[PDB]
């Protein structure tokens, strides 16, 4: 009497649709029906009712094995194992050579429709059918991107967004004008500013003139009532000219060319939290970030009052967390992580059904178009028995071999209500 076995070719991944249903795979048995018992290898997976059965016996040569899944209301693959026990020695059944355990890959298929909804940082509304831009596929090809939230958001004169380019990326030798880059200074000096490392200085600016335009009441008070030093009164200002050409990108904001006139380009790059600093007020580690010190507002704000914050997430849970309760509250928001310190500006996330996030519209500084372009947000590992660490990938669209970016962290920008608030029932006080 031999002792009856049972292979299945592990190559073969079992790939369930996404709809919810009891799929089925089979498994060879040789010499007999051997009695064993299939299990998940995690039995605590949610998306998979229950354990997996042997649903039918009745072919001699081979056993069909039933398993039970919800519907995969995701973007992306799941993965689940089954392995099978020998009922009798209680021990997990070898695989072709022997060695490893009997592994079944189950590979439930990602959602083709799913249904998306989309937050954007406060005050800048919303993109409009007619501003969203599909991409082509690059390797550009004639191919498109069919993910509905895969768009580049376009700036037209009626959108709110900001993104700030370098000029260094934009310029072309012998074509642009010879005096791109120059700027004309706070002495009405003739400075020639570069930004070729300036990422944290581009998305500084961009979440400036965001908070400059939701503060625009309380800085016109604060013109009207501080006592200005008068070197800096031109400085309270945001002007973001939309619709200028790639040739005029030096007179589009001036934020940005304070940054590129005055800060440094240093190769390392910097910080956005110092450059924001740097721009609302006076702390001893930004005494030299530039050749002036702007902080402009430091009758509101001190490092112990401050509206700037930074915290790093490793995990979905912790970089989802970080982006709901940022997108909640007000706040802009800068991406940071290193690569040199790399930073871009985000305005918005996509949801799917299941409040995953799954892509990021990103202010790219380096990037040639003014739009938003699409940053996919994926994992590596799983998503629903999250090991200690999960890091947040992002895939850019644009480019045609998206190297993978790990989000180290999020340094944000709160409007600074209550600190405004309190600066302002002090005047009213004194009056
Ligand atoms: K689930
Ligand atoms: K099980
Ligand atoms: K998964």
Redesign the pocket.
């Known amino acids: 009497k031999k002792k009856p076995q049972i292979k299945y070719e592990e190559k073969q991944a079992v790939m369930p649709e996404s709809a919810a249903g009891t799929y089925t795979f089979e498994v060879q048995t040789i010499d007999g029906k051997l009695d064993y018992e299939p299990y998940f290898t995690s039995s605590t997976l949610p998306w998979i009712t229950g354990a997996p059965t042997i649903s039918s016996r009745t072919d001699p040569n081979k056993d069909v094995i039933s398993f039970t899944c919800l519907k995969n209301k995701t973007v992306?693959?799941?993965?689940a194992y089954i392995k099978f026990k020998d009922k009798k020695t209680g021990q997990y059944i070898k695989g072709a050579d022997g060695k490893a355990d009997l592994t079944v890959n189950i590979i439930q298929k990602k959602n083709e429709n799913p249904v998306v909804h989309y937050k954007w940082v406060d005050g800048i509304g919303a993109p409009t059918e007619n501003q969203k831009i599909k991409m082509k596929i690059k390797n550009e090809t004639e191919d498109y991107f069919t993910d509905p939230f895969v768009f580049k958001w376009k700036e037209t004169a009626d959108t709110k967004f900001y993104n700030v380019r370098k000029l260094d990326k934009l310029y072309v030798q012998g074509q642009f004008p010879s005096n791109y880059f120059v700027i004309n200074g706070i002495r009405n000096e003739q400075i020639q500013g570069r930004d070729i490392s300036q990422c944290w200085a581009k998305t500084a600016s961009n979440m400036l003139h965001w908070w400059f335009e939701q503060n625009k009441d309380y800085i016109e008070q604060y013109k009207q009532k501080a006592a200005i030093e008068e070197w800096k009164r031109p400085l309270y200002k945001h002007d973001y000219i939309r619709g200028l050409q790639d040739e005029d990108e030096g007179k589009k904001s001036n934020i940005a060319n304070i940054f590129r006139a005055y800060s440094h380009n240093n190769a390392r790059g910097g910080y956005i939290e110092d450059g924001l600093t740097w721009y609302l007020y006076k702390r001893d580690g930004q005494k030299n970030l530039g050749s002036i010190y702007p902080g402009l507002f430091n009758d509101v704000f001190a490092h112990d009052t401050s509206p700037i914050n930074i915290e790093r997430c490793e995990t979905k849970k912790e970089f989802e967390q970080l982006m709901n309760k940022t997108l909640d509250n007000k706040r802009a928001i800068g991406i940071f992580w290193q690569g040199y310190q790399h930073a871009v500006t985000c305005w918005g996330a996509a949801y799917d059904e299941d409040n995953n996030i799954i892509c990021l519209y990103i202010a790219e500084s380096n990037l040639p178009e003014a739009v938003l372009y699409p940053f996919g947000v994926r994992?590596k590992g799983?998503?629903?028995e999250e090991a200690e660490k999960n890091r947040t990938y992002m895939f850019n669209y644009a480019l045609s071999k998206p190297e993978n970016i790990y989000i180290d962290g999020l340094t944000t920008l709160d409007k600074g209500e209550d600190q405004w608030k309190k600066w302002l029932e002090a005047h009213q006080k004194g009056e």
Not at 76 to 79: D, E, G, M, T, V
């Open positions: 992306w693959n799941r993965r994992y799983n998503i629903y």
